[PDB]
Amino acid sequence: IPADFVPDSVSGMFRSHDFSYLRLRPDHASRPLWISPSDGRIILESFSPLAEQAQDFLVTIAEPISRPSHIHEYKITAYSLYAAVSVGLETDDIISVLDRLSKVPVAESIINFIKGATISYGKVKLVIKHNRYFVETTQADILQMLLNDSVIGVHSFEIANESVEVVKKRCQEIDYPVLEEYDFRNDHRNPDLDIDLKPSTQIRPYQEKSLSKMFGNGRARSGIIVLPCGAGKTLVGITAACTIKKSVIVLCTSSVSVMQWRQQFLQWCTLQPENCAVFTSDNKEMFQTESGLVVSTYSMVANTRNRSHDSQKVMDFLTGREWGFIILDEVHVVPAAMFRRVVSTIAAHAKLGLTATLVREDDKIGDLNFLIGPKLYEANWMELSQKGHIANVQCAEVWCPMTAEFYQEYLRETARKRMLLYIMNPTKFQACQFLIQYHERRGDKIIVFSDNVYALQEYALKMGKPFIYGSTPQQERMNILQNFQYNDQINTIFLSKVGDTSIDLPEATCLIQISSHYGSRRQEAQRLGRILRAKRRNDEGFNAFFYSLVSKDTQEMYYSTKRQAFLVDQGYAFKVITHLHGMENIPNLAYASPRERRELLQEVLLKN
């Protein structure tokens, strides 16, 4: 507080929130920045100068809390300041630029916070010498304090691979973080891989920014890069591998993703299909070349329950290979306990994380700081939406009025079956039937998401068009997928948690949700990203269409609000629709008669 700040009569519910004690600079017209010192928040104008220069700086040193079109709510965090000094930035420069572009005097607490969040950058480093995690620090000053720490037990010494994760967490805790910047040009101990950036690949500007933020020194800075759906993360990883030119391993959490990234990699880089050996229960071949790649999903390394000897040979081979680069695509699942064996198993130098969503239910997402590193780059979602890099969606949330026909049983149903009982409302069937009619009238490919296989198959059967879920085999689901894509008999399909994420299905510009998870925001966000990567995200007059059929009179409204609040905060609003269109103009409605409603009620009473 640069004032006396005598408490105003209107500042009572302003519990240290009345931010008028600051002496506002007369350059408030030009400068775009406020500071909120009560919570560390930052208030940013979208209509004053210096904001274009300050936007990347605020992303680097701060995190945004909310970014609508008019005012961006940012927040300086120690995580973001560590990311800033890891990119290469410092407290004094941050304070100087902040006072240069700030309308307001710089707060003492914020000054102290940025002073504290300055790391010993360059002091603590680790290298791998023949599959050997050697902790090579620049001084014995590091060795004294680290041996002073009781966990541990120029100059380089060994720390065990499982102990590497624990000591990285510990050194982050004592705020002595390690930078992992591979000198792949200087290191020739690893086999260099003759892969070249083909002229057929040219890079987007924000992707070039993402590379150069972690290629500022020419070394590969290890961390996270968060890019939206369809941004070209495969292209970013291909460019990083082609400019590293070493043995590289990339794991993604689907065999379909294995299968698609292998073809993407052999397409847009000069690595050879001989050098790429694909590992799965389809085939477990190995490449015998000095340099190349072996791809598998996380399952064929995590599992030890039912493993083949050829799988054992392959995982032995990858254990033997000292890789120079690792990318954990869809990094939201690798910090799970059966999945965080990556450091314990794979000897790889540079650790990059590419994913769409950097959020989850628990705090395992922050473990990537001592698993792979901080966020090296992020692309602004609404900026790419207006840039056409991702889509523009007219989301329409459908508040289906609850039928008492199903509510009378739903209220007296036990808790494990209340969910399946209120998913299956005949009014919801009626609304979905007219919505499918209306969007096939508009000529849009529609994909329907249900959390339950039986509800998915019942909706699919009432449509007369097939279903795909997680228990459906891969051959049947791809047959149904190609039937939907090319065959005009299959105009719409019925997808599930194999369709929510980790697939490339951007044709469906229309999406209707009949069910979802209880409170998993990431499933809903990935379902939105399924159509955010749509091909017609660039044409004029485009708005994608998202629909959520949710039953009234429940907790499902609060559930959908919880699942949607991340997208609302992103900028993907959820508009209110209760009275739908074309109600009764549709002649023939699924379970329209009350006898039909009681029929479906006792049909689902057979299970519930």
Side chain identity at 188, as an amino acid letter? H
Taking CB atoms within 8 Å and a gap of at least 24, the contacts of 64-72 are 65/41, 66/569, 67/380, 67/382, 67/571, 68/571, 69/382, 69/571, 70/46, 71/43, 71/44, 71/45, 71/46, 72/42, 72/43, 72/44, 72/46
The CB-of-198 to other proteins minimum distance in angstroms stands at 8
| In the complex, minimum distance from the CB of residue 226 to Mg ion, in angstroms, rounded to a whole number | 24
Task: Assess 541 for contact with other proteins (CB under 8 A).
Answer: yes
Q: Are 466 and 481 in contact (CB under 8 A)?
A: no
Residues 322-341: x/- map of binding to Mg ion (CB under 5 A)? Answer: --------------------
From the list other proteins, Mg ion, none, partner contacted by residue 496 (C-beta under 5 to 8 A by kind):
Mg ion
Q: Does 495 bind Mg ion (CB under 5 A)?
A: yes
- Which residue in the set 291, 496, 526, 560 belongs to the binding site for Mg ion (CB under 5 A)? 496
Task: Take residue 533 and report the two structure tokens written for it.
Answer: 């990567």
Measured N-to-C along each axis, helices 78-87 and 108-116 cross at an angle, to the nearest 10 degrees, of 50
Q: Coil, helix or strand for 511? A: strand
Specify the DSSP element, H or E, that contains 512: strand 510-513
549 touches Mg ion by CB under 5 A: no
529 assigned ligand-binding residue: no
Between 201 and 520, name the residue whose CB sits nearer to other proteins. Answer: 201
Q: Candidates 110-118, 119-127, 200-208, 558-566: pick the segment binding other proteins (CB under 8 A).
A: 200-208
Q: Hey, what are 253's tokens? A: 């959490």
- The strand ranges marked E within 538-600 are 544-551, 575-577
Decide: 142 and 311 in contact? Cβ < 8 Å.
no
Closest CA to 554 of 403, 369, 344, 339: 403
Residue 227 assigned ligand-binding role: yes
201 near other proteins (CB under 8 A)? yes
Residue 198 binds what, of Mg ion, other proteins, none (CB under 5 to 8 Å, by partner type)? Answer: other proteins
Q: Tokens 């591979």 sit at which residue?
A: 182
Among positions 335, 499, 506, 529, the unique one binding Mg ion when judged by CB under 5 A: 499
Nearer to other proteins, 233 or 428 (CB): 233
Residue of 202, 303, 485, 602 interacting with other proteins (CB under 8 A) = 202
Say if CB 389 and CB 380 are below 8 A apart.
Answer: no
SS3 track for 113-137: HHHHCCCCCCCCECEECCCCEEEEE
Q: Which stretch binds Mg ion (CB under 5 A): 91-99, 132-140, 490-498, 525-533?
A: 490-498
Is 443 a residue that touches other proteins (CB under 8 A)?
A: no
Residue 313 among known ligand-binding residues: no
Q: Pick one of 100, 198, 307, 535: the residue that binds other proteins (CB under 8 A).
A: 198
242 has binding-site annotation: no
200 lines the binding site for other proteins (CB under 8 A): yes
Distances (CA, A) of 18 to 7, 11, 38, 109: 9, 6, 10, 17
Enter the tokens of residue 523: 């499933």
Q: Which of 498, 568, 573, 592 binds Mg ion (CB under 5 A)?
A: 498
9 binds, among other proteins, Mg ion, none (CB under 5 to 8 A by kind): none
**Does the protein bind Mg ion through residue 505 (CB under 5 A)?**
no
Residues within the interface to Mg ion (CB under 5 A): 495-496, 498-499
Binding residues: 227-234
Residues within the interface to other proteins (CB under 8 A): 198-203, 540-541
